[PDB]
Design a binder for these strands. Sequence first.
RNA 1: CGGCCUCCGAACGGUAAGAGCCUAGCAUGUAGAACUG
Lengths: 107, 34, 48, 143, 222, 290, 167, 299
Amino acid sequence: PAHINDFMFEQQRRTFATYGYALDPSLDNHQVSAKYIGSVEEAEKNQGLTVFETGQKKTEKRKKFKENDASNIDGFLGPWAKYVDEKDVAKPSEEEQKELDEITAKR
Amino acid sequence: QLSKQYSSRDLPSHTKIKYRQTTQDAPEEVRNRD
Amino acid sequence: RVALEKSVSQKVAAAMPVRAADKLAPAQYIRYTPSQQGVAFNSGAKQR
Amino acid sequence: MPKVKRSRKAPPDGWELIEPTLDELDQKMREAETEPHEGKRKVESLWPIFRIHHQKTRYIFDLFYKRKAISRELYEYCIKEGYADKNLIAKWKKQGYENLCCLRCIQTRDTNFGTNCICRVPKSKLEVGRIIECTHCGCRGCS
Amino acid sequence: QKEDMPPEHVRKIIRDHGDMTNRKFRHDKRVYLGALKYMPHAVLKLLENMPMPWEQIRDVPVLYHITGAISFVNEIPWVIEPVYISQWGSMWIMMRREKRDRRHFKRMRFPPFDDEEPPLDYADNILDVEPLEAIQLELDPEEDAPVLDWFYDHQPLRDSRKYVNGSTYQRWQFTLPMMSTLYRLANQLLTDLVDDNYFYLFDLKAFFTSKALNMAIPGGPK
Amino acid sequence: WEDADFPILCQTCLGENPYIRMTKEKYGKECKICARPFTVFRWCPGVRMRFKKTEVCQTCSKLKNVCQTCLLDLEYGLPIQVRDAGLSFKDDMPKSDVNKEYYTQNMEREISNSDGTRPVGMLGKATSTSDMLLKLARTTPYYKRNRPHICSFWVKGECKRGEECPYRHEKPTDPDDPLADQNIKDRYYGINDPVADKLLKRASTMPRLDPPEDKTITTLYVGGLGDTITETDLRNHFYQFGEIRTITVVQRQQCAFIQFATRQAAEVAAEKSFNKLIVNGRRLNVKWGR
Amino acid sequence: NMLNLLIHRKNLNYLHLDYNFNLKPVKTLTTKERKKSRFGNAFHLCREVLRLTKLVVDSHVQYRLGNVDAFQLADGLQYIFAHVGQLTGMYRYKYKLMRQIRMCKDLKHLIYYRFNTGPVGKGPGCGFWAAGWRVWLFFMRGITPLLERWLGNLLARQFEGRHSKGV
Amino acid sequence: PIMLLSGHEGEVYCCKFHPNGSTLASAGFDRLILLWNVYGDCDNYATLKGHSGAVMELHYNTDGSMLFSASTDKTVAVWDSETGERVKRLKGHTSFVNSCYPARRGPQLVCTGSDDGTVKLWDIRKKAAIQTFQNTYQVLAVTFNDTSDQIISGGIDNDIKVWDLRQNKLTYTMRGHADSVTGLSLSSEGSYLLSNAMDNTVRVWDVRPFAPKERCVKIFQGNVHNFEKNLLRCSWSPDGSKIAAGSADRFVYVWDTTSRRILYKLPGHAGSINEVAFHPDEPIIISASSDKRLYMGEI
RNA sequence: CGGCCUCCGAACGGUAAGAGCCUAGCAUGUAGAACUG
Ligand SMILES: O=P(O)(O)O[C@H]1[C@@H](OP(=O)(O)O)[C@@H](OP(=O)(O)O)[C@@H](OP(=O)(O)O)[C@@H](OP(=O)(O)O)[C@H]1OP(=O)(O)O
Ligand SMILES: [Zn+2]
Ligand SMILES: [Zn+2]
Ligand SMILES: [Zn+2]
């Protein structure tokens, strides 16, 4: 029943999630060094920045809309505003559709 | 495997033990007596 | 007296059945040492 | 036929220019309410209701605070008559919470680990751009 | 903190589920069932906040289950004592003068609905209709000035920290004009006694002695 | 019901991130083995990877020493039919309803007298993990396990939720495959697991050293020696494994030949040595010479 | 919904509970069904308490739908509370109710024979329902723990099973 | 015995003895300060109140009568151990005050390190600032010099610094720390200073009228850091003999000055040890750990 | 100067017990998923 703090575990988890590498946590009686585990060369080339700590990313932010006038009768997507580079209807290939009808026959 | 059934008789009741007081006959006076 | 009374009070709260529930206790933080050791799993760390 | 008015006191005098907006928003709230329970889903049929609610109260949030095109006492009447959302507003007034979608999206008790929805985490910290659907509102990154 | 919701939320869930026959819900089945153990709480709560015939609509805080299984009116109906007595005394005078001045009172029919006439939908039927003048009595503007506006309010002086301790609605302080007007108005449901030398052999202790001696006062209990 | 400290599952089922998050519910559901209420701990497997949950009583687990989520053994990680047979193991676990309930009850009684360290019974007296099991054992975390199902909507077209199809929107497997419908209870009972029969066919076709005809062929050719080897090193490879009679280390062909003093000793050394007698890193081939 | 789920989970298809909370069979019931379909004071006491509240709610629904009147509503409520004896039929499941029922008759007598002190007539136009309201509310204060215990036990025995093992 | 102490709402960050060794001070997140009897059964009597942020440093006087405490809520505070009630609220500190150091046997004064970018001197009497050396960054550790004429500080530049109280410029800067400076402690010699750092290496120096101008004398291996980056604190023995340290491995580190061997790496703990207190009279140790308790080891 | 005014109704105990038989429901919503010189 170790006792740790959490905010640092949550920062570690944010990193290990969105950057893919993690500060290795093993608390061995063999004194290891602070090492980046997971996507090692990713953390190395990224200088170890965690998903929480601010750092510069020229990553293309996914294309979004913005209708913020709540006076429009049919307007306000507001906080719910769709990302504009998204499809309308998620329809899977006609191929798998015909094959799925066929399999629903097969059973 | 502890059930949730229950009973009218197992409701809490008589929840303090009357301890035998000083004048009635406490184990102290029994320690003494001849 | 001590161990007795604890087991008593658990069996007694059994006859509560309407538990006026207490809330959920503080979160558990546990250190796990797998017996499986190896560079490939846990992506290379000896503890979680 | 409207949200029939209880106070019996006369609405203060900026009501007449939010009048048709409020009326229309109520009508389409009614319609999106009776909108029946399709093969749609059961978790996802409670998004439009918060959409319309947040819609209306944002409208009034502008028309009192960002324009000052309305009287204090009118807008008070229009909360007390259940169009607006006094608590949503008193939070919206915060620094990081301008677009908080549904006032349940920050309820810390509403979730097992004691957090908010990922609907609240700013997308820059996510960096993964996977469409985020907060179950409650359906909303898309309110913050 | 835990915060309120639009009413249409619950209303949608509940008219959605209806009577749990649709295979869609199919798990709130068992939760619905398990909610039966508390149905006698819901009923006591509902019935102790009923709307007190001079008001046409009363709104109350409602706590409910995220699948609509149960709905506890979460409120305790505090009232100010002389306020309450005076209002019901007004009711007394109105009922008597009215049934005297009415040509023939009709008795409504119970059950008011038929056995398989399902319960009606609130919104779709009763939400918007006009609520039908209540049993208000008309107080005199000179005689009853100190109250004339706030009398028949659901919780009258709810918001005036000059009169009410707060938004919890306790600990009231009142003006003597107010009090004398009220007194005069609740004059009907009241005792025209000034002291206790009336109840000489007619009080709790006399009755306790009687009960113990198996004797009976002429007009007292046995 | 039972009460736990944490689950029991392999690394694959167990996860990758250093900080794992799992929620507990006491008396959450019914072990399809012990049939009774268990605790349920639910673990977040991977990024957009299906949250798993503990799926067997901890005693139902310590019984056969397998994974309470991954369902495969915890030492090797092959089907339980396989691992048992690879120990030559033969468990008498009862099957019928009353028989099984009586068995489970006395089993929990007998396991209550344990210290929580290792499975009960023959699970230790079969701990000679045969190189057959070692070789059938997977090497890296086959982390395809935490990918979702086939989004039946997305199989017909319908999965209109965008990318949030709750399931991998791929081509659904033709259930004609024996690797498709393996009833969890049967997989636990070691009852006709077609994946286990596949492991049997694989560990039957996998290369092992061959036997010769006449008993008097006691010369054994080890192919692929190299010039870092010694005759005493070939000996120490095949010396106390019996007695050797002679050894020819062919340096003009990079091989060896052990003439033995016990035929079964030769068999032990060579058959255990097939392609895996790795002293100083050279893949030798153990056969019976001409 | 709760009570109907209870029936139909018990698999009693031949009984149906209608909307004024009367329980009515749709067949002729054999013995085995006559017996399997018996219910006890828990089920029936809820049924009848729900029936009282439904009658109250539905007088109020008539008023707000607009059919009746404020005065007609008040008089109807007074009725309901004085005549709980012949509307519901709860006394048959907790015969200790007649405490309450005698209390509401005594109030009725007091109120009426002071109410018609003058020209006022001895007819229906009297709704002054504070008193009987108090009475049945105290009755409810008392009955809620009892019914919670009985219904918890009914549900428990429904979902776990009855313990004929260690009686 | 073992004598594990408990009662804390959170992690225990700061622990020390009476400069008598009569009553014991511990504290951490909980924004109050627990005090105990060290002897007997290790009894827990009194709790100081008030400090809004986590009490980042407790500091006695050297006799044992007054109590200084630097709390993260922008303030240092003086209190009477006689009472437990605050004598001064040393405010003005523009950000998180980490460290406080009251001068021993000199006139009444404190040097304070904080999260602003300043080292600040303050007087107990004036409610006024005496000096402020802005190097450029937040100041994490401060210990005086035994003349109370230099101020030693450890911050974020790994470059251990000392100010002249009179010449007011950077008197001594010494370097060799592999990463940030986390703990300073002046031995009872008045001369040697002890410094821990998360970089796994801890250092000793000697601040004299003459030291070799490169005064990195003794170095100890074992201290750990992790993704927590919690505060690390160390001490000498009352005899300048045993080096006492905690760390984020759950091992309390006991070395000697002389052979610099591992005298102990003691387990027992569940939490990362955030402060070790040596007894001014006894072979008594109290280990304040992030497991929301303490230990009292006898050696 | 005398006053005195119980009550009140429902259930079980009566209209067999059975095995088979057959089919809705009702529950499940899971676990897994393959390899080389
Ligand atoms: O049995 P109950 O429910 O109480 O009601 C009736 C009735 O009541 P409603 O007017 O409420 O329908 C009359 O009572 P009053 O109105 O006269 O008070 C009546 O009185 P009479 O027939 O004497 O006119 C009668 O009395 P009883 O049954 O003793 O003959 C009796 O009221 P009570 O039962 O309350 O007496
Ligand atoms: Zn959300
Ligand atoms: Zn939301
Ligand atoms: Zn949102």
